[PDB]
Design a protein around this ligand. Structure first.
Ligand SMILES: [Cu+]
Ligand SMILES: [K+]
Ligand SMILES: [K+]
Ligand SMILES: [K+]
Ligand SMILES: [K+]
Ligand SMILES: [K+]
Ligand SMILES: [K+]
Ligand SMILES: [K+]
Ligand SMILES: [K+]
Ligand SMILES: [K+]
Ligand SMILES: [K+]
Ligand SMILES: [K+]
Ligand SMILES: [K+]
Ligand SMILES: [K+]
Ligand SMILES: [K+]
Ligand SMILES: [K+]
Ligand SMILES: [K+]
Ligand SMILES: [K+]
Ligand SMILES: [K+]
Ligand SMILES: [K+]
Ligand SMILES: [K+]
Ligand SMILES: [K+]
Ligand SMILES: [K+]
Ligand SMILES: [K+]
Ligand SMILES: [K+]
Ligand SMILES: [K+]
Ligand SMILES: [K+]
Ligand SMILES: [K+]
Ligand SMILES: [K+]
Ligand SMILES: [K+]
Ligand SMILES: [K+]
Ligand SMILES: [K+]
Ligand SMILES: [K+]
Ligand SMILES: [K+]
Ligand SMILES: [K+]
Ligand SMILES: [K+]
Ligand SMILES: [K+]
Ligand SMILES: [K+]
Ligand SMILES: [K+]
Ligand SMILES: [K+]
Ligand SMILES: [Mg+2]
Ligand SMILES: [Mg+2]
Ligand SMILES: [Mg+2]
Ligand SMILES: [Mg+2]
Ligand SMILES: [Mg+2]
Ligand SMILES: [Mg+2]
Ligand SMILES: [Mg+2]
Ligand SMILES: [Mg+2]
Ligand SMILES: [Mg+2]
Ligand SMILES: [Mg+2]
Ligand SMILES: [Mg+2]
Ligand SMILES: [Mg+2]
Ligand SMILES: [Mg+2]
Ligand SMILES: [Mg+2]
Ligand SMILES: [Mg+2]
Ligand SMILES: [Mg+2]
Ligand SMILES: [Mg+2]
Ligand SMILES: [Mg+2]
Ligand SMILES: [Mg+2]
Ligand SMILES: [Mg+2]
Ligand SMILES: [Mg+2]
Ligand SMILES: [Mg+2]
Ligand SMILES: [Mg+2]
Ligand SMILES: [Mg+2]
Ligand SMILES: [Mg+2]
Ligand SMILES: [Mg+2]
Ligand SMILES: [Mg+2]
Ligand SMILES: [Mg+2]
Ligand SMILES: [Mg+2]
Ligand SMILES: [Mg+2]
Ligand SMILES: [Mg+2]
Ligand SMILES: [Mg+2]
Ligand SMILES: [Mg+2]
Ligand SMILES: [Mg+2]
Ligand SMILES: [Mg+2]
Ligand SMILES: [Mg+2]
Ligand SMILES: [Mg+2]
Ligand SMILES: [Mg+2]
Ligand SMILES: [Mg+2]
Ligand SMILES: [Mg+2]
Ligand SMILES: [Mg+2]
Ligand SMILES: [Mg+2]
Ligand SMILES: [Mg+2]
Ligand SMILES: [Mg+2]
Ligand SMILES: [Mg+2]
Ligand SMILES: [Mg+2]
Ligand SMILES: [Mg+2]
Ligand SMILES: [Mg+2]
Ligand SMILES: [Mg+2]
Ligand SMILES: [Mg+2]
Ligand SMILES: [Mg+2]
Ligand SMILES: [Mg+2]
Ligand SMILES: [Mg+2]
Ligand SMILES: [Mg+2]
Ligand SMILES: [Mg+2]
Ligand SMILES: [Mg+2]
Ligand SMILES: [Mg+2]
Ligand SMILES: [Mg+2]
Ligand SMILES: [Mg+2]
Ligand SMILES: [Mg+2]
Ligand SMILES: [Mg+2]
Ligand SMILES: [Mg+2]
Ligand SMILES: [Mg+2]
Ligand SMILES: [Mg+2]
Ligand SMILES: [Mg+2]
Ligand SMILES: [Mg+2]
Ligand SMILES: [Mg+2]
Ligand SMILES: [Mg+2]
Ligand SMILES: [Mg+2]
Ligand SMILES: [Mg+2]
Ligand SMILES: [Mg+2]
Ligand SMILES: [Mg+2]
Ligand SMILES: [Mg+2]
Ligand SMILES: [Mg+2]
Ligand SMILES: [Mg+2]
Ligand SMILES: [Mg+2]
Ligand SMILES: [Mg+2]
Lengths: 93, 271, 46
RNA sequence: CGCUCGCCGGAAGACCAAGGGUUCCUGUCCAACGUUAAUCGGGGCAGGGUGAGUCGACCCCUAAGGCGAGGCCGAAAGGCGUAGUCGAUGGGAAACAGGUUAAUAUUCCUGUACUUGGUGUUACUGCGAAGGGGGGACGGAGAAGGCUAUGUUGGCCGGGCGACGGUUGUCCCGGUUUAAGCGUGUAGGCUGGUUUUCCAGGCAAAUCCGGAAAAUCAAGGCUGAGGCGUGAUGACGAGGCACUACGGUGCUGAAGCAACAAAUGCCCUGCUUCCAGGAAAAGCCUCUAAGCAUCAGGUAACAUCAAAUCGUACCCCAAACCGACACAGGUGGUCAGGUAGAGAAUACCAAGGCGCUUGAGAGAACUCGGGUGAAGGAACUAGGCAAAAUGGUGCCGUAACUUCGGGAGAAGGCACGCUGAUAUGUAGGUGAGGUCCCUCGCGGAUGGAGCUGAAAUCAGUCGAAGAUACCAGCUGGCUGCAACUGUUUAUUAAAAACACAGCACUGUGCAAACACGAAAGUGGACGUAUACGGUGUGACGCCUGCCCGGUGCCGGAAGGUUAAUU
RNA sequence: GAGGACCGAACCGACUAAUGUUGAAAAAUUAGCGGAUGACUUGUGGCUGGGGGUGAAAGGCCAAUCAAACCGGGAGAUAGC
C-alpha cells in the first residue's frame, strides 16, 4: 500500500501538446508531468485514486532540460519526468 | 626422430624438428590443468627484472607429481604427452584405486608400463624410492633435496644424476653440472633418466621460432650509447674495456656464488 | 593525423576523478589546494 | 518547386559503439556568426520531441589488474599481501512481422509469441551445501560437402502499341513479398548401449565421477543447418479510383509460381592436420554431509501476480568526435545489388546520396596539372632525376650458377574480336514426371524432360589496330656490402646500422646466479644445468695461426707489509 | 596442402619526385613505392614515473616538450656580461 500522502505528491500537471492530444483521442492515453522520482506503480496508483479511472499501463521517460541564455547569463532548466498513462477502454478523463 | 626441413623458404632451410609419434594428439587431462598467465619478465613493482621475456604462445600449466609419495599402489602409464611448460615430456598414469596423475616421462617409458613408489618398490625405471634403498652407482632423476619436499634436481630432458657413494645419513651425487653434492639418504629419487634426450638436437631455424617461445631480442651492450651500458659508445666499432654486465660486474669468469649456508654440502664444485 | 587527446570517459574518471583523488594523501592535497583557491569545479567528475 | 546536366556508389550510401550534448522537428528573425549575397543555416529567439519484462545499462560471474580486515615490513608518509572485495574488452533468461509521428519506435498500435520469478490449488514424492563430480571450456592452418542470404531467366498478373523508318511479337515496362514462434526431424558430426557385483581415488559422505570383473544386446543416445507444415480466409502488394490545405491524404487491389546460379553467412565450438600445444568463474546438471521427518523441500499441471530503475532525440570516415577554423588529415564494428571482371581491383550504373558557401568575364608573360610532336635518341645530368616504356591468359621455350628448393614470369616467341558449323547448345553441372523396390520416408535404384553451360576445331568476316577502354612486370651483363623475412632516428638519415637462427666464452646446485626493492617480498620459475643469466660473434661452406710481458679474471697461501682491537 | 613462401586490394607502412613552405595540413596532397598468415595488424581495459621508465639501440620515445618531462616551490638563484 502506497500512502495517500505520497500519492498526492507524484502527479504534477497535465502535459498539453499536439502529441498529447493525439494520444488522448487515438489511444485513450493521457500525458502527465510527474515527480522526477515517481515510479510507474506510484503513478498508476495515484491516477486511479485521484482521477478515479482504471489504468491499463504506464510508460515513462525523462526529459532533459535545455540550456538557455538570459541577458548573457547561461542557465539550465531542470530535468522532468513525463508519463504516458493508458486508460482502460471505456474510461473517460 | 630428428627431421631436417626442406629448404622451400629461407626461414625453413635450417629448421630441425624433433618429431615423436608417441605423444598424445588430443587434449590434456583437464582435472590436472591450471591457467598460467605471462609476466613479461616484470615483478610486482611492474619493472622489468629479467630482460628478454615477452609474448609467445598461450600455455596451460600441467600439475606434475614431483613428490611421488603414493606408496605401495601400482600405476599404469596410459599415454605420453607434450607439456609446453618444460623440455621433458610427461606421462599420464592411472593408479589401481582410480586416481590419475602426471609424472615426468623417463627414457624408455611407454604406455602399458607399470610403476610404483616406496621403500619396497622394484628397482626399475620410473619407480621411486628413498635413495637409502637405491643401489650405489645407480642412475636416477627428479631427485629431492629435502625429504618430502619434492623432486628438484635432474628434471630437464635427458638429464640424470649418479649415486656415487653412501656414507651414514648422506649420499654423494654426481650432478649434470659436474658438481659432487651431498644429499640426505632419506631423499627420494626416480630410477632412470629423464626422457626426450633428442631435445637438444632441434634447430629453431628463424627469429620467429624464438619469438614463439616467449624470448625477445637481445641487444648487445657495445651497440648502445654510454648512458645505456658500460660497453656503449665509440666512433665506429670500439670496445677497449673489460666485459661487464649492464650493471658493471665482470662477466667473463668472475664468480658469483656466495652461500655459506649450503657450502657444507658441496663436496666438489663443477670446476 | 592522430592527435594526443583521445577521449574516454572511463579513463578520464579513473585517472583524475573525485574518488581517485580521494584514494591518496597526495590526491587529497590536490583537493585541499583547489578548495583553498576556490575552484568552481574541483575535479573532472561530471 | 520543376525539367535537364554532372559527380560518388566496398561510398561521397545505410546503421552502430566511442566521443559530443539539443546540434533533432516546427514556427519566426537576419544585428553578429557563415571567408560573398542570403529570403537560407549546425546562427538568434520561442514551442515541441526520446514511451521497453524481451534492445542496452544496472544485475549474476569472473580476466589482466586494483584495493585489501587481521597480517608481514618500513624513521613518519608509506610498501607488500591473506581471507575477501572490486574490475570487461569475455561467460550468463526471453519478440517478431506489419502500420503509424513534423520529430520515438523490436519501446506506440494491430496480429501472433516467448522468458524468469513470487504466490495459491491439485497429484506424486527424499529434500538438503560454503563441500564432491560433470559442464560451461576455448589454438593455427587447410579441405570439401550440404545449404541459405541473394541474383538471373522463364511462367503468371497488370499496363503498353510509341514525337523519326519499324514495332500484335521469339515485342516493351512493372510486380511476382510474407517474420519470430510452434510442429516435424533431414544433409551431416560425435559416441557402443543396458543390467549386476566389488574397490587403498575425488580432505567426510555419495546412488554422482574414477577404477576392476562379469552377463546380455547390438543399435541406442546426444547434437544438427536447411527444407516442409503452421503462423497467414491474415498482412503487404503493380496500379486504379476520389479529394487536395496541390505538401499529400482516403478507398480498393491482380499475380504472388518454378528453374538455374550462389557467398567471405549457416551446418562448423564440426572435420582433417600441425606444433608454437591453445582463459577463468558463475548460470546449468548431478552427488551426497550436518540437518529436517505423514513438516519443510522437490517434480509436474493449472490459475494468478510481478519483471523495477536509468538510457533511447540527433551527428558518427563527420560542418556536431580528435585536429584553435563549417580545416583536402585521423577515427573501431556491421551491411554488400547490376554488367564486364579472378576480385571487396577497376570502369559504367542501382538503391541512396551529392555539385564540395564567392561569383562574372578575358583567353598576355610566368607558375601549376595534363595532351601531342618533325629529325635525332641520354648528346641531358652528380646521377636517365623526371618522363617514356613493359604490363593479361593459354601454349612453345628458357643459360651460367646453385645450399638442388631455386635462378625463372629468366630470356624469347606464337594465339586472342565477331559470325556459322561440328552441336536447331557440345563436354560437364543440375535435375522433374514416369517405373521398380522397400525395414513406407525429408527413402533407395533406374530414368532422363526441363534448366544451365565452358573449352576446342573447321569455315567465313570487319578494322590501321581484337589482352583494343580502365586495369596491367621493363629486361639483360659485371661488381661492393649485409645470409635471408623482420627493426630504426614520430617531424631532413631505412642503411652497409639494430635484430636474427647458428656459434663460443662465462656465471648459476635452487632460498640459483641475476634484477626491482632501506625491508617484507616479487620477477627469474610453479623453471632446475638438454635449465636460467651475462657477454661477444652473426645463415651456411672452408676455417679461426703465434704472444700470458701489461690490464683483468681464476687458483695458491710459506714469507714480507698492513685496520679496528689490546 | 607446408611456408617469418609467391602476385595482389582492404589494412599496416614511408623508398623517389613534383607541389605546398604567411600551407587545405605546426609533417600533408598527387603520381609512383614496401609488407600484406605474421618477429602481422587492430579495439577495449591494465602496468611501468624522471637519473626514473621503455628501447629488434636512433640518445629513440615518455601528451605538437627530451644528453634528464611537466607543474608548483627554494626564487628577486647567480650574471666581473
Ligand atoms: Cu692485517
Ligand atoms: K615441451
Ligand atoms: K644481439
Ligand atoms: K662500444
Ligand atoms: K659505437
Ligand atoms: K657512433
Ligand atoms: K590513464
Ligand atoms: K571560412
Ligand atoms: K554576392
Ligand atoms: K532557426
Ligand atoms: K587477479
Ligand atoms: K583479486
Ligand atoms: K507462474
Ligand atoms: K584443430
Ligand atoms: K519476370
Ligand atoms: K517509334
Ligand atoms: K558390451
Ligand atoms: K516457419
Ligand atoms: K553442486
Ligand atoms: K529511439
Ligand atoms: K568507377
Ligand atoms: K585577361
Ligand atoms: K588574357
Ligand atoms: K579470325
Ligand atoms: K540433362
Ligand atoms: K546438357
Ligand atoms: K604484371
Ligand atoms: K660473410
Ligand atoms: K628500407
Ligand atoms: K638501427
Ligand atoms: K650459456
Ligand atoms: K653454404
Ligand atoms: K646452407
Ligand atoms: K699477455
Ligand atoms: K697476464
Ligand atoms: K697477509
Ligand atoms: K591482441
Ligand atoms: K633511455
Ligand atoms: K603536457
Ligand atoms: K630528471
Ligand atoms: Mg524507459
Ligand atoms: Mg537546477
Ligand atoms: Mg603495487
Ligand atoms: Mg637474455
Ligand atoms: Mg616456458
Ligand atoms: Mg643471442
Ligand atoms: Mg648508435
Ligand atoms: Mg658509464
Ligand atoms: Mg675505428
Ligand atoms: Mg684500439
Ligand atoms: Mg666498471
Ligand atoms: Mg577510444
Ligand atoms: Mg534545385
Ligand atoms: Mg542551441
Ligand atoms: Mg535542422
Ligand atoms: Mg554575410
Ligand atoms: Mg543586406
Ligand atoms: Mg538553430
Ligand atoms: Mg507497453
Ligand atoms: Mg538482453
Ligand atoms: Mg594491497
Ligand atoms: Mg591493515
Ligand atoms: Mg564481482
Ligand atoms: Mg562486456
Ligand atoms: Mg529519426
Ligand atoms: Mg564446480
Ligand atoms: Mg570462451
Ligand atoms: Mg581455429
Ligand atoms: Mg534461395
Ligand atoms: Mg527466401
Ligand atoms: Mg513511327
Ligand atoms: Mg518481364
Ligand atoms: Mg511460409
Ligand atoms: Mg577471408
Ligand atoms: Mg535513433
Ligand atoms: Mg565549406
Ligand atoms: Mg573534415
Ligand atoms: Mg580505418
Ligand atoms: Mg560489384
Ligand atoms: Mg572502387
Ligand atoms: Mg539514385
Ligand atoms: Mg592558359
Ligand atoms: Mg607546363
Ligand atoms: Mg606524352
Ligand atoms: Mg620527337
Ligand atoms: Mg603524326
Ligand atoms: Mg618520330
Ligand atoms: Mg633507338
Ligand atoms: Mg654524358
Ligand atoms: Mg655535359
Ligand atoms: Mg624514375
Ligand atoms: Mg608513366
Ligand atoms: Mg638473372
Ligand atoms: Mg543449383
Ligand atoms: Mg590510373
Ligand atoms: Mg669497390
Ligand atoms: Mg639485410
Ligand atoms: Mg615499431
Ligand atoms: Mg626522420
Ligand atoms: Mg626517410
Ligand atoms: Mg623465489
Ligand atoms: Mg630476498
Ligand atoms: Mg617467486
Ligand atoms: Mg657484428
Ligand atoms: Mg704471468
Ligand atoms: Mg687472488
Ligand atoms: Mg609472405
Ligand atoms: Mg615506423
Ligand atoms: Mg601515396
Ligand atoms: Mg617480396
Ligand atoms: Mg604483396
Ligand atoms: Mg624531481
Ligand atoms: Mg650518436
Ligand atoms: Mg613528443
Ligand atoms: Mg640535470
Ligand atoms: Mg635562496
Ligand atoms: Mg633573476
Amino acid at each position: 500500500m502506497i500512502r495517500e500522502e505520497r500519492l498526492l505528491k507524484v502527479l504534477r500537471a497535465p502535459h498539453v501538446s499536439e502529441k498529447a492530444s493525439t494520444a488522448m483521442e487515438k489511444s485513450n492515453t493521457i500525458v502527465l508531468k510527474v515527480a522526477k522520482d515517481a515510479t510507474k506503480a506510484e503513478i498508476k496508483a495515484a491516477v486511479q485514486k485521484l482521477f478515479e479511472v482504471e489504468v491499463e499501463v504506464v510508460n515513462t521517460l525523462v526529459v532533459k532540460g535545455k540550456v538557455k541564455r538570459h541577458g548573457q547569463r547561461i542557465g539550465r532548466r531542470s530535468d522532468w519526468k513525463k508519463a504516458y498513462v493508458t486508460l482502460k477502454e471505456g474510461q473517460n478523463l | 626422430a630428428v627431421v631436417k626441413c626442406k629448404p622451400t623458404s629461407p626461414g625453413r632451410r635450417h629448421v630441425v624438428k624433433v618429431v615423436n609419434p608417441e605423444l598424445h594428439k588430443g587434449k590434456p587431462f583437464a582435472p590436472l590443468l591450471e591457467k598460467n598467465s605471462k609476466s613479461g619478465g616484470r615483478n610486482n613493482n611492474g619493472r622489468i627484472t629479467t630482460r628478454h621475456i615477452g609474448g609467445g604462445h598461450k600455455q596451460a600449466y600441467r600439475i606434475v607429481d614431483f613428490k611421488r609419495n603414493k606408496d605401495g599402489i601400482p600405476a599404469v602409464v596410459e599415454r605420453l604427452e607434450y607439456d609446453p611448460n618444460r623440455s621433458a615430456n610427461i606421462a599420464l598414469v592411472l593408479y589401481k584405486d582410480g586416481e590419475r596423475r602426471y609424472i615426468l616421462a623417463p627414457k624408455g617409458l611407454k604406455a602399458g608400463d607399470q610403476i610404483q613408489s616406496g621403500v619396497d618398490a622394484a628397482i626399475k625405471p620410473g619407480n621411486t624410492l628413498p635413495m637409502r634403498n637405491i643401489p650405489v652407482g645407480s642412475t636416477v632423476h627428479n631427485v629431492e633435496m629435502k625429504p618430502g619436499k619434492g623432486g628438484q634436481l635432474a628434471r630437464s630432458a635427458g638429464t640424470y644424476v649418479q649415486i656415487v657413494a653412501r656414507d651414514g645419513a648422506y649420499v654423494t651425487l654426481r650432478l649434470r653440472s659436474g658438481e659432487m653434492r651431498k644429499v640426505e639418504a632419506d631423499c627420494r629419487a626416480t630410477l632412470g633418466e629423464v626422457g626426450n634426450a633428442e631435445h637438444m638436437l632441434r634447430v629453431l631455424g628463424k627469429a620467429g621460432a624464438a619469438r614463439w617461445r616467449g624470448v625477445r631480442p637481445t641487444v648487445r651492450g657495445t651497440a648502445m650509447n654510454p648512458v645505456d651500458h658500460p660497453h656503449g659508445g665509440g666512433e665506429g666499432r670500439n670496445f677497449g674495456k673489460h666485459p661487464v654486465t649492464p650493471w658493471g660486474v665482470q662477466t667473463k669468469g668472475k664468480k658469483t656464488r656466495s652461500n655459506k649456508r649450503t657450502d657444507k654440502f658441496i663436496v666438489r664444485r663443477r670446476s | 593525423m592522430k592527435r594526443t587527446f583521445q577521449p574516454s570517459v572511463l579513463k578520464r574518471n579513473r585517472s583524475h576523478g573525485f574518488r581517485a583523488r580521494m584514494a591518496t594523501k597526495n590526491g587529497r592535497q590536490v583537493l585541499a589546494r583547489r578548495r583553498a583557491k576556490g575552484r568552481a569545479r574541483l575535479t573532472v567528475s561530471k
